[PDB]
Amino acid sequence: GIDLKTGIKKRKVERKEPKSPNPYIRLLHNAFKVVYENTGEDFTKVLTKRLCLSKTNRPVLSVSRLAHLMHKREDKIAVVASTVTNDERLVTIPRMTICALKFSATARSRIEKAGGRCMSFDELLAEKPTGDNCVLLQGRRSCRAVCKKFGSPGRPNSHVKPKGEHKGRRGARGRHSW
C-alpha cells in the first residue's frame, strides 16, 4: 500500500534498440552500445540514440548544407546520422570527410571529385570511437510536410494549413469571417 503516485509522473517510453530489421544497423548500435557502456563519452551516447531514431526522425543532410555547416572547419570529420544526398545547386563543393549511414550514388561522385572521403560508419568505429575531431550533425527534423499540416487549422492561434482543396469562403477571409 505505497502511494508512490505523487512523487512520480509515470514511466516514459523511449526506443532502446533500433527496431529496424536491417541486420547491419542493429550491429552498429550494438557496437556503439558496447563502446558507450565501457566509456561514458557523450559523443558515443548521442551516436547510440541517433541510430535508434525512426526513419522519419533521422533526416537528409544534403552536401550543400553540410558544406555550409562545415565552411569554417572542413578538416573536422562530420558524422551525419542519416542518408546524405548531394544537391547540385552548389556547383563546386569543398573537400569534406563525412561519415554517414548511406551516401547517394551522385553524392559519392561529388565528394570524390572534391577530394573528400565519404568514409562509412564502420570505418568511423575503427578510427574514432570517441568522436575526436568529429561533430555529429542532423538535418531539419521539421522538414517533413506532414510536420507543417500538423495542428488545429481553424482556431486563430495555429497559423497552419487545412488538408484538402476546401474552396470555401466560410472561415477563410479573416477572424471576422465565420
Partner 1 sequence: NPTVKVFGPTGTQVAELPRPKVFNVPLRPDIINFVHTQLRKCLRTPYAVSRYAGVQCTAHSWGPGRAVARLPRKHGGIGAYANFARGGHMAHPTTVIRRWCRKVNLNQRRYAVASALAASANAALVEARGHRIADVPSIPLVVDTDNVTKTKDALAIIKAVGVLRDVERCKDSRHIRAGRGKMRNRRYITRKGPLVIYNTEDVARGFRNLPGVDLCHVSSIRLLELAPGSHPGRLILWTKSAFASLDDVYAAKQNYTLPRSCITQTDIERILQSDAVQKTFVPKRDPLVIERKVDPFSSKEALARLDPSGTVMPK
Partner 2 sequence: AMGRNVAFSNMRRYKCTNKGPNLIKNWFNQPA
Partner 3 sequence: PTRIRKSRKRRGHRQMGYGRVGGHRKHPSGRGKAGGLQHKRTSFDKYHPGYFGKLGMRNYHVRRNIEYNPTINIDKIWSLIPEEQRDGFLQRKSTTEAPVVDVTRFGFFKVLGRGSLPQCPIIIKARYFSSDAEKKLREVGGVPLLVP
Partner RNA sequence: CCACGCGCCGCGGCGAGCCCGAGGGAGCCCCCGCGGCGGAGCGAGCGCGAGACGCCCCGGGCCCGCCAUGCCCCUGCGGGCG
Using CB under 8 A, list all residues that contact partner 2: 149-153, 163-164
Helix runs in 73-128, H state only: 105-113, 121-127
* Binding range to RNA, per CB under 7 A, among 37-45, 91-99, 102-110, 123-131: 102-110
Q: Which three three-digit cell numbers place residue 55? A: 526513419
Considering CB distances under 5 to 8 angstroms, the limit depending on partner class, which of partner 3, partner 2, RNA, none binds residue 107? RNA
Q: Cα separation of 69 and 64, whole Å?
A: 9
Phi, psi of 155 (to 5 degrees): -60, 135
Question: How far, in Å, CA of 7 to CA of 4, rounded?
Answer: 6
As measured in angstroms, the least distance from the Cβ of 68 to partner 1 is 27
Supply 123's cell numbers. 570505418
Q: Binding residue for partner 3 (CB under 8 A) from 2, 4, 13, 91? A: 91
- Which stretch, 65-73, 95-103, 134-142, 163-171, contacts partner 3 (CB under 8 A)? 163-171
The nearest distance, CB 125 to partner 3, in angstroms, is: 33
82 contacts RNA (rule: CB under 7 A):
yes
C-beta of residue 115 within 8 angstroms of C-beta of residue 135: no
Residue 98: name the closest of 90, 89, 115, 142 by CA.
115
Name the residues that contact RNA, by CB under 7 A: 18-22, 25, 54-57, 60, 62, 65, 68-69, 82-83, 85-89, 102, 104-107, 136-143, 145-146, 149-150, 161, 163
